[PDB]
């Protein structure tokens, strides 16, 4: 398999945003009167688009006032403010992106988060220039684990999805890359460390600091 491009996941892979999304969700849900202690009633939501999480909450504990979409955009805005404020770049990111270029690869971003947030996070770490294409799953009918966002990214990159390696922190994200028939590297979130399903990935890293050219190219 000939690798021409590397596509990075964003939340929990490039940035330590999972705690920040949690906080944004918590704060907004609490403001609506939603009983948060019942968080255990929801399925695992790691890697799921925010709209799916808000829908899950709304199915357990409906609320009045703002619609689910209005709640989605409040959570998004809050998560973004938290990201700007803390600048949570994960270890090894800068080096990993550089390595991709050193190894002759195009570089993409494929995320469930809105395109404006993708642009914002990359620009804030002076990484926008290194990314040849960005793809958001926001407007799409289905986000990860549906492969559409990854296929869109490959198309914007101008390469066959088969020539891509996707770096992910979640099972849902990994499945999206495999449903697109891509090579997969995972750097599992702390919340997912010993998930047996990561056996589907081609490479498993404890951190992006450990990333090598062999991991990328096979």
Interaction site with a copy of itself (CB under 8 A): 142, 145-147, 151, 175-176, 178-181, 196-197, 199-200
Contacts of 102 (CB under 8 A, 6+ apart): 213
8-state DSSP, 16: -
Asked if residue 85 binds Ca ion (CB under 5 A), the reply is no
x/- site string to Ca ion, residues 20 to 49, per CB under 5 A?
A: ---------------------------x--
Q: Which stretch binds Ca ion (CB under 5 A): 3-11, 33-41, 135-143, 180-188?
A: 3-11
9 a catalytic residue = yes
Strand 5-8 to 203-204 pairing:
unpaired
CA 55 to chain centre: 19
Peptide bond into 106 cis (omega under 30): no
Asked if residue 11 binds Ca ion (CB under 5 A), the reply is yes
55 a catalytic residue = no
Q: Around 137, how many Cα atoms within 13 Å sit in the side-chain half-sphere?
A: 27
| Residue 25 interacting entry, from Ca ion, a copy of itself, none, C-beta within 5 to 8 Å by type | none
Q: Give the active site residue among 11, 16, 152, 169.
A: 11
| Residue 126 interacting entry, from a copy of itself, Ca ion, none, C-beta within 5 to 8 Å by type | Ca ion
- 151/174 with CB nearer Ca ion: 174
Measured distance CA(177)–CA(172) in Å, rounded:
9
Asked if residue 104 binds Ca ion (CB under 5 A), the reply is yes
Apex CA 154: angle with CA 156 and CA 182, to 5°? Answer: 175
Q: Give the active site residue among 9, 16, 51, 152.
A: 9
Nearest to 72 by CA among 50, 57, 89, 92: 50
Q: Which residues are catalytically annotated? A: 9, 11
């Amino acid at each position: 398999r000939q690798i021409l491009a590397a596509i990075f996941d964003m939340d929990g892979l490039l940035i330590d945003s999972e705690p920040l999304w949690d906080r944004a969700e918590l704060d907004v849900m609490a403001s609506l009167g939603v009983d948060i202690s019942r968080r255990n009633e929801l399925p695992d939501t790691l890697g799921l688009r925010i709209d799916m999480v808000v829908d899950l909450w709304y199915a357990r504990q409906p609320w009045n006032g703002p619609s689910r979409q209005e709640v989605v955009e409040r959570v998004i805005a809050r998560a973004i403010s938290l990201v700007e404020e803390t600048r949570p770049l994960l270890p090894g990111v800068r080096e990993a992106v550089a390595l991709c270029k050193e190894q002759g690869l195009l570089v993409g971003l494929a995320s469930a988060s809105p395109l404006h947030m993708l642009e914002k996070v990359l620009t804030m770490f002076d990484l926008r220039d290194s990314f040849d294409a960005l793809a958001s799953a926001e407007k799409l009918p289905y986000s990860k684990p549906h492969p559409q966002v990854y296929l869109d990214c490959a198309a914007k990159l101008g390469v066959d999805p088969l020539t891509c390696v996707a770096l992910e922190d979640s099972v849902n994200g990994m499945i999206a890359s495999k449903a697109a028939r891509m090579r997969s590297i995972v750097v599992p979130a702390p919340e997912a460390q010993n998930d047996p399903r990561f056996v589907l990935a081609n490479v498993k890293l404890s951190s992006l600091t450990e990333l090598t050219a062999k991991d990328l190219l096979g």
